[PDB]
């Protein structure tokens, strides 16, 4: 286990799932909050 | 031909003399460093240019220093 | 005992995360730990150098056997997802019932940010993206009829993935093989030749002969699909079987009797296309597979193993030796059977050699049912097997090179071969540098004498069909031959193998399947463009090959190795003189080998073969047959062919087919990004870097791991990497969209 | 001891030890990776809002201040808008100016323990007007103490059910 | 206007494009038939089609001749929410990225292994530093005045 | 000759171990690759949710309903009941909670696994039936227990296929 979270640890992993969750939510905004060319 | 230029800085590692494709460099007896030699470069007429030297030189800034200039038949190694 | 026996370890390597925690524990100059941001790059560059990871071959061996599953896992679960996204997300049915209309697609976006106009309006009530990989086609062949049984076989797929990975593991931490086992080569071809190929065939027929020929005659004719008997069906109740085939009745009686012939039904040597579907006939696909089969077999007892009875490879190798050929092959075994390296070079050539072959035979012969028609299909596969081989007979020198530098022993080569080939290294590179500039100044001279006679107002002093022409006698030779064998020198045939040499216009739809393709001078010019480029590449990758080990301006240049930067700015220069720089180079001409290669193809059939004919005998070719008399200038295949064919892409925007031209300018930024790698040096970036690191510095705070400029053979391979996806993008999206129009 | 009492298949997280709610339930061991007394006061504020919120999201249903007397949403829900973003914005600055003031300063993970406060008991602020913790033992200030963690996880629980039963049910929730 | 441009609500080229636009979906819809998922995913882009133009219709948003909106960015808090409003945002968001990276480069580079901690980030402490950037301004502005931010000369630099 | 009592043709399979239910039966040797805490925790987990499985599925057929039944789950047979879960969003609340269930579990076997000293398939609830019996008495419960879930799985196998290869009542 320690070491494993270690592996998930590593830099290209980490950058790879905050990616993913960095874009999901843009992702989610642009979904329920869609077509924004400003603040209204 | 090719201008080969050692400096005080030498520390007579003979790293330099051990890299040289063409028998350029030797270590002569020297009392400025703790090893107690230095590097010569007596003949300079079969640089070729490789500055292997200088990419085996351990001090901060080469001790060594190649500087390219006239072109002869040796200098730019060609075998015909 | 044995000759041949299996030898394992038990527990060879404990299955823990430790290492996966400690990044660049395969080196030793890696483990010691990130100083620099070199040390990243290296960790991805030297992860799969098993040779310099570790100096035992058995170790190596381990490493490749466990590695290769680890490849095949990946591969079914390719597959398998293909099988889902066509079982779920496809309009295979629809397609199935009305083939010639509704057109095959098999990925959907989702609905979000505009991105659905992707989804095109396909056909048979459905909406997605056009696909071109040909899955509709061979599943038809097939004979799978339902979207169950694709279902089925991608859980197949899911499985078999996870029983390679299984065994990769297993075979690597539980039970290694050892060095002895690895090296039956005679046991291995045998296994290989007549295990793999020879059952593998045999098993396809079965399934061809039992399930699909009845299924295609049923479809063919006009059943629906629905009314087609399931496959179980036609297995067991033999009486439907004789129905269609009707020798099934007779049993398999003849067969172990001499009486052959009797399966004439299903056997067959037509020839030719179905004039239905517009594809080879399965009962002589059967009859091919069953053919190759016992030929397989029969190989696959040639080597001895363990019974005395074969050959032994290195008596044969040893015995062919001649009067201008010193000991002949000798030495040859022993490097086969100790270098992986040596084994990759031939087997990678040979690997891309063959996929470049697949690409002429199966648009010339087209294989599958309905395929021909699919223009789209067809330019896709041939550009794309086109590609792959490129890539492999390039990457088969690289690795012969690698041979030389790391694996070549001079006490173990004397007088063979291979030394004598290294002995003569500077007649064979003179001589092809010739010949390569004799073909390109004659080759390409006449596109340029063309242009500037047709630009001054002399017509008629062009080296056209209309004036001074240069035609393909051979080649037309070649084609008549082959056009009156059937009945002749082909006796039981009934048909050419190719309506490409001559024959009648085979039609599936009102559009144009097969034709003849005739040859003139518009022909015999490419065709010799063809041979300069091939020509070229061999030069450079060749002279790597040779010169290795040692040059006469570098003389050890074996010690630097097969991967450095230079000699230094000495000898006038010695730049990119690395056996790795000479496969560089060699890739780009590999790029411009194959463009003009497929670009021939896609201009040849959309003028003089694909198009629509009437009901009456009138042919309309896509662009008209503007090849004869534009595509012997530089002038016309710029205005003729890429300003003209490239209106689709240019105009996809608010379409179906706008991603193409997306990606069209997309690729082209990425082709031009790379040209700053190709043509700067690192000193400069080096310097820049030093600047922004003063930066950050007089804020109180810079990374311990110093930022550094890529290495030089680094910023030369990220270079190459951006140029080859840069071109071969554009061209990707330019034929698609256009060919998704011309279908 | 060796196993948690919330959790009797599983070793008792330490660090969850003698704290007044602790019961032991920490399977995913976050008194490991970060400091038990920025997560005790975090769950101590987050108990007390969720009270006041939960009191609030019945009370308006009902009742309104006079100033907003015109202005009544059943909902709740739907409150925040009519009240408008000034409005709402106004609370949240205010709300801000105070939290620095009682940190003073130390607003952040890595100082609202440190120097002066370091010795600060989670959730303690000093706020008793009444008094009502006056000369009571210790155990009555910790049994006290208990009641108000209990009932603030209580809480915490019960406004997003409020909230997300409006949502989903669609009307007030009474 | 300013610069001679016109409202969206009061411009016939926008109403032309809308109109258009919807259109082109309406047709390809009526290939399709009733209930036809088909369809009813045309029909489902329609409506946004014409709640977006809504939308800017009812903004402040100002069109040209072309009909298409333009944007206005010379400091004018009148169209604020084109460029300053979400400007800020960006700022905000920005900065508290950089100043929580600075900050655990800066607080790992006394540990240990100053090296291992930037390929294999200890995930605990990063998330403590990064929450703590949301008062990146104040921080930062502290940090100047207490000359703790710029450096003093003690850096390396070139030969010349 | 340290024969499998199950198989007393066959060499009793080692890295087992000598607990409950152990009869000597892995003829596939399956523990050579596994550890068997992990293996034992499967079997059970397994073998009690069929056991559940089978008495609801039963049930469900025979007439047992929740009387306040949710729109539709009326005329509809524990073959058909599935989609109408998921569309009613039963299922969904199921899968949600066991979810959350299978995770602390993960947890569980993995100090099981690092030597925590968990039983498999112990988490302590017993409803003090074993509260004071000694471990001879400890164990034949614990036997009874395997024995059930071991034959449960056939059963409810043997029903779903039934039942959906021959649509009928509860006895198919
Ligand atoms: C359009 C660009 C272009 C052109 C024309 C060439 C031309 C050439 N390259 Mg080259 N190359 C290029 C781009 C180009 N390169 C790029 C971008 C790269 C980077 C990867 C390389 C990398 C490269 C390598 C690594 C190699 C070449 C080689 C060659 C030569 C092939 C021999 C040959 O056909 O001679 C004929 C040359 C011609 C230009 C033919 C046209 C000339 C006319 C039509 C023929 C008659 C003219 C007559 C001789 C004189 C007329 C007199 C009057 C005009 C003054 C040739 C000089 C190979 C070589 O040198 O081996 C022989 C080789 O090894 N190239
Ligand atoms: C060659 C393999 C392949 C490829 C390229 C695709 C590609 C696609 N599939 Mg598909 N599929 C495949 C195999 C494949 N599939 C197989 C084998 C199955 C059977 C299980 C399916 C079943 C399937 C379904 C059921 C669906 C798709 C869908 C899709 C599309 C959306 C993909 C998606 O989820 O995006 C979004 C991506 C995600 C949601 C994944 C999240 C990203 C993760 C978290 C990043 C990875 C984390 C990283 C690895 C961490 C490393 C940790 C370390 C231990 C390694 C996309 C075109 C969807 C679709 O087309 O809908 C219309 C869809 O519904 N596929
Ligand atoms: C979960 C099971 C598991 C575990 C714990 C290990 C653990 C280990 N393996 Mg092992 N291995 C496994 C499964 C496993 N393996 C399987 C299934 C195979 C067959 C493919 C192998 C094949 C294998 C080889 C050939 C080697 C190891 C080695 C090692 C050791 C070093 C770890 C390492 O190199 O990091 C690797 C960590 C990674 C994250 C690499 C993953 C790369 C992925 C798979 C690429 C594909 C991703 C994607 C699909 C492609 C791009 C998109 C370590 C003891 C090495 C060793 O030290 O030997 C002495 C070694 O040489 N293993
Ligand atoms: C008749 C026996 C047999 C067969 C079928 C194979 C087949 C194969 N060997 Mg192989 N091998 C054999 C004997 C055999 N070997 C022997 C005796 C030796 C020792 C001298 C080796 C040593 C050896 C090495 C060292 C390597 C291979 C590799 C390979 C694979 C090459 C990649 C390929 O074509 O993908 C085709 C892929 C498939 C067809 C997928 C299916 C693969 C499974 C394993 C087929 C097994 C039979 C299957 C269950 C069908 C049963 C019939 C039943 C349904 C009625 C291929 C799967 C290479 C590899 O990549 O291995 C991982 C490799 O590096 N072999
Ligand atoms: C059967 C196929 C095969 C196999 C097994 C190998 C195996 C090997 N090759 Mg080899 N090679 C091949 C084909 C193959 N090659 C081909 C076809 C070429 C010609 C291009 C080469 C060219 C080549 C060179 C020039 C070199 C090797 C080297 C090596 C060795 C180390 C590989 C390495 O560094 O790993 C690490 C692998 C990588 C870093 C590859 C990662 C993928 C990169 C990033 C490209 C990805 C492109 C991607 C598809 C684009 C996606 C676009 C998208 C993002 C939009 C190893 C023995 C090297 C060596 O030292 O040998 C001893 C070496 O110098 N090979
Ligand atoms: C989480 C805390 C919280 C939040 C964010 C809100 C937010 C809101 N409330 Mg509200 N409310 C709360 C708690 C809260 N309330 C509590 C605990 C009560 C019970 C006294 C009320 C009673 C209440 C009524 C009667 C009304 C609102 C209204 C409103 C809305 C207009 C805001 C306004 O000016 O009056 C809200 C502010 C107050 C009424 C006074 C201050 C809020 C505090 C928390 C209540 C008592 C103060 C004290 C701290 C709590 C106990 C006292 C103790 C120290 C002795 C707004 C959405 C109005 C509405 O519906 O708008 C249309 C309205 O008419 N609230
Ligand atoms: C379940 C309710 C509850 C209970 C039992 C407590 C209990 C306590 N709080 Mg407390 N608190 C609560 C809710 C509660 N709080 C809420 C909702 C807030 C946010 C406004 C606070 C904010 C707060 C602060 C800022 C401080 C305390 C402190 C204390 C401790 C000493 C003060 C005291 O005797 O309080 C007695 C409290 C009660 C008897 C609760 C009465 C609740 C009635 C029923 C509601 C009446 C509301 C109405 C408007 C008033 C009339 C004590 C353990 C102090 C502390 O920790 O010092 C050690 C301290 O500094 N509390
Ligand atoms: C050099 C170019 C330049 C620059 C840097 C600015 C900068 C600024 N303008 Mg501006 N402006 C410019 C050219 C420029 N303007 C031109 C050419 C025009 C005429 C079209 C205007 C018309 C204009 C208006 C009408 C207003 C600003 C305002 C502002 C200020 C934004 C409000 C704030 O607090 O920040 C800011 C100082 C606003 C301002 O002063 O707010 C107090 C404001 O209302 N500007
Ligand atoms: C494998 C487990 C399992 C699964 C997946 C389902 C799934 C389903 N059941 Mg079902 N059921 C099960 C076991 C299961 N059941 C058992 C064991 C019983 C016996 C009481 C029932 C009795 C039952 C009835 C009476 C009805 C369903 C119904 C349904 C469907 C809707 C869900 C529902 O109403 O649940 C309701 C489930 C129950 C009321 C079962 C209650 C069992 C007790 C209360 C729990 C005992 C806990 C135990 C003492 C200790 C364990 C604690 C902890 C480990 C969880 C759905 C298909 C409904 C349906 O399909 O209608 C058409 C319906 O009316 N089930
Ligand atoms: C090509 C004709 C041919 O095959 O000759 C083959 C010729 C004679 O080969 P030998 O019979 O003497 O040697 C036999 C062994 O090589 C095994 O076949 O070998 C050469 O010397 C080739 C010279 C370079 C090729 C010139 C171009």
Redesign the pocket.
Known sequence: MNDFQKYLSTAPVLLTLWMTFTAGFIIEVNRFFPDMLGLY | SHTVKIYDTCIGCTQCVRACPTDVLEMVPWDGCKSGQIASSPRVEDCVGCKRCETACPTDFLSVRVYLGAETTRSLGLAY | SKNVQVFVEKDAVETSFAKWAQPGHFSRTLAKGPKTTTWIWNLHADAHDFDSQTSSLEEVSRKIFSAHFGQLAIIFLWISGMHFHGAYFSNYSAWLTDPISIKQSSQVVWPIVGQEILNADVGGNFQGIQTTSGWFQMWRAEGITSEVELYWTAIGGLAMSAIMLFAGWFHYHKAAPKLEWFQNAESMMNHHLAGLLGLGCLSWSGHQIHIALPINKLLDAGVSPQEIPLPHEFLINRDLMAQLYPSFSKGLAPFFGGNWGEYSDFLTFKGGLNPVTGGLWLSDIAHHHLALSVLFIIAGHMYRTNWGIGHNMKEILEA??????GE??KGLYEILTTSWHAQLAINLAMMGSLSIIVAHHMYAMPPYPYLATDYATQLSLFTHHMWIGGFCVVGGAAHGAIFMVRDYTPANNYNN?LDRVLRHRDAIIS?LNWVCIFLGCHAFGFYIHNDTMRALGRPQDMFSDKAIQLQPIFAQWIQNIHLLAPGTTAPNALATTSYAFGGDVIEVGGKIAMMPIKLGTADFMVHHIHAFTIHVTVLILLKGVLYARSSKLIPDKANLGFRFPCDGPGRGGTCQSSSWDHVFLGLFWMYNSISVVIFHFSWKMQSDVWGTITPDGAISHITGGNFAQSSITINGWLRDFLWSQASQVIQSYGSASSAYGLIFLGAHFIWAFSLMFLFSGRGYWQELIESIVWAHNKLNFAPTIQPRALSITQGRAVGLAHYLLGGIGTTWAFFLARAISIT | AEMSKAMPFLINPANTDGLIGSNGFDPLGFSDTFDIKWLQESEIKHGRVAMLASAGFIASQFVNFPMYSSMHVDDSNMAPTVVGISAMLQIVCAAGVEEWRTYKGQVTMEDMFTGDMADRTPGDFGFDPMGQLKGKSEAAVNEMKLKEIKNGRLAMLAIGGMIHHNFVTGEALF | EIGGLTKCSESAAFTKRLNASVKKLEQRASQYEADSPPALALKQQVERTQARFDKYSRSELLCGADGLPHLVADGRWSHAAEFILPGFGFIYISGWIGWVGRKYLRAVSTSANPSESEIIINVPLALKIMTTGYIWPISAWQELISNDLVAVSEEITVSP | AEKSASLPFLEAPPNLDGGVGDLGFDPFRFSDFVPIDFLREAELKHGRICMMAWLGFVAVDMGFRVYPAAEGFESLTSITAHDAAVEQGGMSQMLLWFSLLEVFDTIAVQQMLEGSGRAPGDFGLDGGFLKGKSQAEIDTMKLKEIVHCRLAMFAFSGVVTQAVLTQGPFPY
Do not use: A, I, S
């Open positions: 062919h030796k001649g009067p201008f050929t002949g092959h071969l001589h």
